[PDB]
Design a protein around this ligand. Structure first.
Ligand SMILES: CCCCCCCCCCCCCCCCCC(=O)OC[C@H](COP(=O)([O-])OCC[N+](C)(C)C)OC(=O)CCCCCCCCCCCCCCCCC
Ligand SMILES: CCCCCCCCCCCCCCCCCC(=O)OC[C@H](COP(=O)(O)OCCN)OC(=O)CCCCCCCCCCCCCCCCC
Ligand SMILES: NC(=O)C1=CN([C@@H]2O[C@H](COP(=O)(O)OP(=O)(O)OC[C@H]3O[C@@H](n4cnc5c(N)ncnc54)[C@H](OP(=O)(O)O)[C@@H]3O)[C@@H](O)[C@H]2O)C=CC1
Ligand code: SF4
Ligand code: SF4
Ligand code: SF4
Lengths: 114, 206, 112, 292, 154, 76, 176
């Protein structure tokens, strides 16, 4: 079960990198909302950031966590340096996607998909 | 024989001899050496050997492979290490080419070869972007070809041809938006392979 | 002495013969720290000694270039520096040691 | 259901919603949002237009190939109305002008034209009819705009009894003549967001219980006109028009409790405070107090 | 009176179609053939179509090549900065409907998903003459415009 | 000043919406009593970083699990 | 074999140094450049008077597609689907069934002209010269939908253009 590490040698070190990334994202949201002239609140921007972290809470592989942080840092670099445009930043919010039905009956009415 | 490509035995022997030469000098890393019937020399190495093997081929006086022609990856999902990393090098001094191949999986970094060849910089970014292979100690590893915020690595065999999202302008929000991809005409998959074996010379033992 | 090497960034060498003797001697000195039975040492000593003999046995630079087959003598000097740099790195890598790890069984099988 | 209009797909651009809609007045403020939401889910949209084709160009990207169809029409020509509606399952009337012209007065845009669309739609067999009226429509209003809206609202209910009639308050949005109107310069107002009105219209098309009903689309908050105009100037970072238009702006927004509203179509009204900056950002070179 | 309005439409229509200043997005292959339309054999300048115009003095955008998802937002921004009246000519299969990359994950399947399009020039690429035919077809479209006639009847 | 420091910590925490004001006590563990998660604690530390105008590293911040450590930590 | 593009040593004799000084001060080489553009001013331009004059083309030119017939009027296409298989862009969509008289014929033959790359592979693959790229290149449209050709449109193109198409095939079939 011996593998080559990416950065972290265990989950404790991986979690430290996660918290540093979260802090960097949390502090950058107010600037992003201003520079990109977004129509969302800073609270919405930070709520979205927290949502994105939370969905990955179950990972226990430090290598997977390392890659998630690597990708998170690249995403933050694109935002901070304004490589993204307004459309790229707003793609986290799916503003034109009408909500898909979730309960069995609503999905049964509209189509065949599970 | 007008239609058959002629063989070149002189080049086949030279490359075979140099293949043994390389494998004798770097036994720590070389796993396999082979020469194709059209005379291309391939060195297969353990991924730890990337920097030492490339440095030897660039700097050694009987090698002098000063030019990195190309660096790419191939995705083979059936393998435990699905990604094959391919270095194609050119030696102007000896008017010869060589191919170096190693392997990695999704979670195992490969050492960046920018220290050996500055040409490797963008190639490794392209491999990261298209295949998701992470290169360690790269001066600036980030996407290069895909759109900003693009999720996934399109050149993987299990990434769909048309992707997952498509763009359009939306008037209500006055910007370009991304939405799940729907196609007016689905791409029509073709099953073209003949059920009769073509090349007996490559038949795999059963 | 030639006016230019023809290669941008590669300056002419005023005393190429003595420069090559210093480099080839340095390479042979470094190769002494490598185990006697490492292929890199045996092969690199062999070629280095072949070039060193030609350098001592030919006083005319253009006759020497014709014998070394390494292009301009300034290119041969640069190649000597490259070998010396490599030899030092080879001592840290120790590539003469056994194969670190075998590949998985089908790692190199093609077609699948 | 005829086989051609059974829904298919996942509700995207290339899907088939099963809606075949004729939208009169599609080239205006409300029309561009309605057509967009119809084309988002892959509806067939027929756009009768009176203007130059150049002025309908913004509608073309709103639907997949073939889903937006354009036709000429004249408000006074019933044959041109029949051509536009005889293949549709729903007719939406968004025709109107905030002012009168030498050729069309308020009695034309708000009575004669809606009645002709309703009558021809009834004759052609159109199942559903959605007619936009006004919250403050009233035959005793000081506004000839609002008096006509009341007369026409009654004639449509008589001509096409199953019509869904929608009575919006002042609508605000990027292309509105409300927030923009103040920025370009006694009374309580309850303005409603454009996307809310659009969603209400779309959900009325689908809801079978909406047939024959009259809805009032209003925003979530009531504001004094003075407090609203003050807020507009603050948001526009600015130091703080016909006669009929002025009367409308000073007409207090009726409170019709008996009518169903946006919540009866599954639509949550959007507060003005969330969207005001979106509309007013381009005007740049403390939330308003609300009535309990 | 209607006679006056008919002749002013003719005047302003004639001026606008006789002085079509294009902005070309030279996105890919098709840009080469628009260069050949400017080149001496066809000399687009002789029709009043200046070779290159800045986006803010432009009347027609020519989308000449493949529009990727990465480039689509930039193209929309340029279209939104064009003073009116403005027209769009889609040139080549890629811009028309995605063409040979229609099934790609990174390609917009036709520039009409991003901007409205007045003329579709088919071909991969359309010849310089085919593009010139499309430009002259856009001129005829402008000749049919009746903005003042319709204004007078509101 | 130690009560001055201690007051500010409670000032910042009160503003933090997720913490119920009544439940808060100077010796209340964020994750046991107040029911906050890991990232809730991270946001608290950045708030203290702003109030006291200095940077609190992750190794230091991971241990500040109730207001008392924060008051105690600042004093050092 | 190689040659040097820019390996020359300027002469330093006073006559040559003064020659370069005169060039620097009198702008002589700039004047020489003016002569070249002047000589073009008086050359006949290469422009042709389109659409009254047309650029030359060959019989091989790949333009708008068309479906052809035999001299009797029977369709040449037998719904073999080789064109659809080879099409690099999947621009061709075909359906087929036995015709009322039992003949093997298509019921759908669509070419998405905005997917097509005008490569001519379909007309190479066709065994009966049914689908061809014709000589027409002036068929730009005002709408996207007009470039989604079905069988009726393609048959009409064949009837419209057959006179020219047949002569072009006659001039090039011995090269195929
Ligand atoms: C200020 C007064 C300027 C008067 C401008 C008059 C321009 C003359 C003109 O319109 O060209 C004749 C034009 C020339 O015809 P054309 O523009 O259609 O071009 C035909 C010739 N080829 C094929 C080469 C392009 O006649 C018209 O098109 C009719 C429109 C007349 C517009 C003027 C109305 C008065
Ligand atoms: C008895 C004694 C009497 C005493 C008086 C005697 C006086 C006579 C001797 C003086 C003669 C001097 C001529 C003065 C002209 C200016 C000369 C000059 O400035 O040339 C140098 C300048 C730059 O040259 P450069 O190659 O860059 O190198 C120099 C710097 N290292 O080169 C340039 O300026 C290049 C200009 C670039 C622009 C080119 C576009 C113009 C080309 C066509 C011009 C045609 C001439 C127009 C004629 C006028 C029309 C009214
Ligand atoms: N916006 C608001 O605040 C509210 C609006 N409403 C009603 O909603 C409907 C649309 O609102 P809005 O979209 O803002 O109105 P707009 O003026 O923005 O658009 C009006 C539409 O009516 C068409 N139209 C006007 N006169 C005629 C005519 N004589 N013959 C044919 N077509 C004509 C216009 O077409 P053209 O472009 O050709 O003129 C345009 O498409 C109207 O009935 C309006 O009264 C009700 C309550 C609030
Ligand atoms: S339409 Fe053809 S020529 Fe034009 S950019 Fe696409 S592939 Fe290239
Ligand atoms: S010309 Fe090429 S791309 Fe077009 S339909 Fe024929 S085979 Fe397909
Ligand atoms: S056009 Fe030719 S190749 Fe295509 S289906 Fe018909 S006969 Fe076969």
């Amino acid at each position: 079960t011996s593998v080559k590490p990416i950065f972290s040698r265990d989950m404790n070190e991986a979690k430290r990198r996660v918290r540093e990334l979260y802090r960097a994202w949390y502090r950058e949201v107010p600037n992003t909302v201003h520079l990109f002239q977004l129509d969302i609140s800073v609270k919405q921007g930070r709520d979205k950031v927290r949502e994105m972290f939370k969905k990955n809470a179950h990972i226990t592989d430090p290598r997977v966590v390392d890659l998630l942080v690597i990708k998170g840092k690249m995403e933050l670099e694109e935002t901070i340096k304004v490589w993204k445009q307004r459309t790229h930043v707003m793609r986290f919010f799916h503003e034109t996607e009408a909500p898909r039905p979730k309960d069995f009956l609503s999905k049964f009415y509209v189509g065949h998909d599970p | 024989r007008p239609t058959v490509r002629p063989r070149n035995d002189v080049a086949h022997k030279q490359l075979s001899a140099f293949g043994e030469y390389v494998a004798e000098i770097l036994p720590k890393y070389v796993q396999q050496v082979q020469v194709s019937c059209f005379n291309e020399l391939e060195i297969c190495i353990h991924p730890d050997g990337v920097i030492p093997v490339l440095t030897f081929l660039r700097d050694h006086s009987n090698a002098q492979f000063k030019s990195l022609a190309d660096l790419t990856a191939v995705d083979i999902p059936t393998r435990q290490n699905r990604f094959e990393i391919v270095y194609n090098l050119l030696s102007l001094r000896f008017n010869s080419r060589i191919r170096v191949k190693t392997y990695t999986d999704e979670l195992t970094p490969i050492e960046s070869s920018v220290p050996v060849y500055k040409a490797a910089n963008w190639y490794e970014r392209e491999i990261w972007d298209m295949f998701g292979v992470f290169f360690a100690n790269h001066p600036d590893l980030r996407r290069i070809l895909t759109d900003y915020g693009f999720e996934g690595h399109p050149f993987r065999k299990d990434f769909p041809l048309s992707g997952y999202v498509e763009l359009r302008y939306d008037d209500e929000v006055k910007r370009v938006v991304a939405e799940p991809v729907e196609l007016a005409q689905e791409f029509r998959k073709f099953d073209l392979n003949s059920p009769w074996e073509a090349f007996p010379a490559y038949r795999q033992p059963p | 002495l030639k006016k230019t090497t023809g290669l941008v960034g590669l300056a002419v060498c005023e005393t190429p013969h003595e420069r090559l003797k210093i480099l080839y001697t340095k390479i042979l000195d470094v190769l002494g720290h490598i185990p006697k039975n490492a292929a890199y040492r045996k092969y690199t000593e062999q070629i280095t000694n072949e070039k060193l003999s030609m350098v001592k046995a030919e006083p005319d630079v253009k006759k020497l270039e014709e014998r070394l087959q390494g292009g301009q003598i300034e290119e041969v000097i640069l190649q000597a520096e490259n070998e010396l740099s490599l030899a030092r790195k080879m001592i840290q890598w120790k590539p003469w040691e056994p194969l670190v790890e075998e590949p998985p069984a089908s790692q190199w099988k093609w077609p699948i | 259901l005829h086989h051609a209009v059974i829904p298919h797909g996942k509700g995207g651009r290339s899907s088939v919603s099963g809606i075949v809609a004729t939208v009169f007045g599609a080239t205006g403020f409300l029309g561009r949002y309605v057509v967009n939401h119809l084309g988002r889910m892959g509806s067939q949209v027929i756009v009768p237009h009176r203007c130059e084709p150049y002025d309908t160009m913004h509608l073309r990207p709103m639907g997949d190939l073939g889903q937006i169809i354009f036709m000429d029409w004249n408000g006074r020509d019933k044959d041109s109305i029949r051509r536009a509606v005889e293949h549709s399952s729903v007719v939406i009337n968004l025709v109107g002008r905030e002012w009168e012209t030498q050729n069309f007065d308020f009695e034309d845009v708000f009575v004669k034209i809606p009645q002709a669309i309703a009558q021809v739609s009834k004759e052609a067999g159109v199942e559903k009819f959605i007619h936009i009226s006004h919250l403050n429509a009233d035959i005793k209003s000081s506004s000839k705009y609002l008096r006509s809206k009341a007369v026409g609202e009654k004639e449509v209910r008589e001509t096409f009894p199953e019509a869904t009639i929608i009575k919006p308050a002042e609508i605000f949005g990027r292309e509105d003549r409300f927030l923009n109107y103040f920025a370009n310069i006694k009374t309580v107002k309850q303005p409603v967001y454009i996307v809310d009105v659009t969603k209400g219209i779309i959900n009325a098309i689908k809801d079978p219980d909406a047939r024959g009903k009259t809805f009032a689309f209003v925003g979530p908050s009531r504001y004094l006109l003075f407090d609203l105009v003050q807020y507009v100037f603050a948001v526009a970072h600015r130091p703080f028009t016909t006669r009929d238009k002025v009367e409308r702006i000073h007409t207090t927004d009726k409170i019709l409790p008996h009518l169903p509203g946006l919540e009866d179509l599954g639509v949550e009204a959007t507060p003005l405070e969330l969207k005001a900056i979106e509309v007013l950002r381009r005007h740049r070179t403390q939330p308003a107090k609300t009535i309990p | 009176g209607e006679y006056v309005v008919a002749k002013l439409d003719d005047l302003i229509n004639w001026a606008r179609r006789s002085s079509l200043w294009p902005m070309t997005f030279g996105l890919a292959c098709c840009a080469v053939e628009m260069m050949h339309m400017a080149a001496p054999r066809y000399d687009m300048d002789r029709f009043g179509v200046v070779f290159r115009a800045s986006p803010r003095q432009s009347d027609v955008m020519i989308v000449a090549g493949t529009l990727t998802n990465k480039m689509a937002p930039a193209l929309r921004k340029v279209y939104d900065q064009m003073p009116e009246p403005r027209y769009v000519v889609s040139m080549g299969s890629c811009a028309n409907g995605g063409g040979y990359y229609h099934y790609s994950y990174s390609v917009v399947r036709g520039c009409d998903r991003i901007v409205p399009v007045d003329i579709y020039v088919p071909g991969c690429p359309p010849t310089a003459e085919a593009l010139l035919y499309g430009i002259l077809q856009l001129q005829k479209k402008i000749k049919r415009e009746k903005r003042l006639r319709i204004w007078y009847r509101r | 000043t130690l009560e001055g420091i201690k007051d500010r910590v409670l000032y910042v925490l009160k503003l933090y919406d997720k913490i119920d004001p009544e439940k808060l006590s100077v010796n209340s563990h964020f994750m046991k009593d107040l029911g906050l998660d890991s990232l809730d604690q991270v946001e608290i530390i950045m708030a203290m970083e702003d109030e006291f105008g200095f940077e609190i590293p992750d190794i230091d911040a991971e241990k500040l699990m109730c207001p008392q450590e924060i008051v105690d930590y600042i004093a050092d | 074999t190689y040659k040097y593009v820019n390996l020359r040593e300027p002469s330093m004799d006073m006559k040559s140094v003064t020659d370069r000084a005169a060039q620097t001060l009198l702008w002589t080489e700039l004047i020489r450049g003016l002569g070249m553009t002047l000589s073009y001013l008086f050359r006949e331009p290469a422009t042709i008077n389109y659409p009254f004059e047309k650029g030359p083309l060959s019989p091989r030119f790949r333009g708008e597609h068309a479906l052809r017939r035999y001299p009797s009027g029977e369709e040449r296409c037998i719904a073999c689907k080789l064109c659809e298989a080879v099409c690099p862009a999947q621009a061709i969509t075909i359906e087929a069934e036995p015709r009322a008289d039992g003949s093997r014929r298509t019921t759908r033959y669509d070419i998405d002209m905005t997917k097509c790359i005008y490569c001519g592979f379909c007309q190479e693959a066709c065994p009966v010269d049914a689908i061809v790229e014709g000589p027409n290149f002036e068929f730009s449209t005002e709408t996207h939908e007009e470039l989604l050709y079905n069988k009726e449109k393609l048959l009409n193109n064949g009837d419209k253009w057959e006179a020219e198409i047949a002569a072009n095939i006659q001039a090039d079939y011995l090269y195929r």
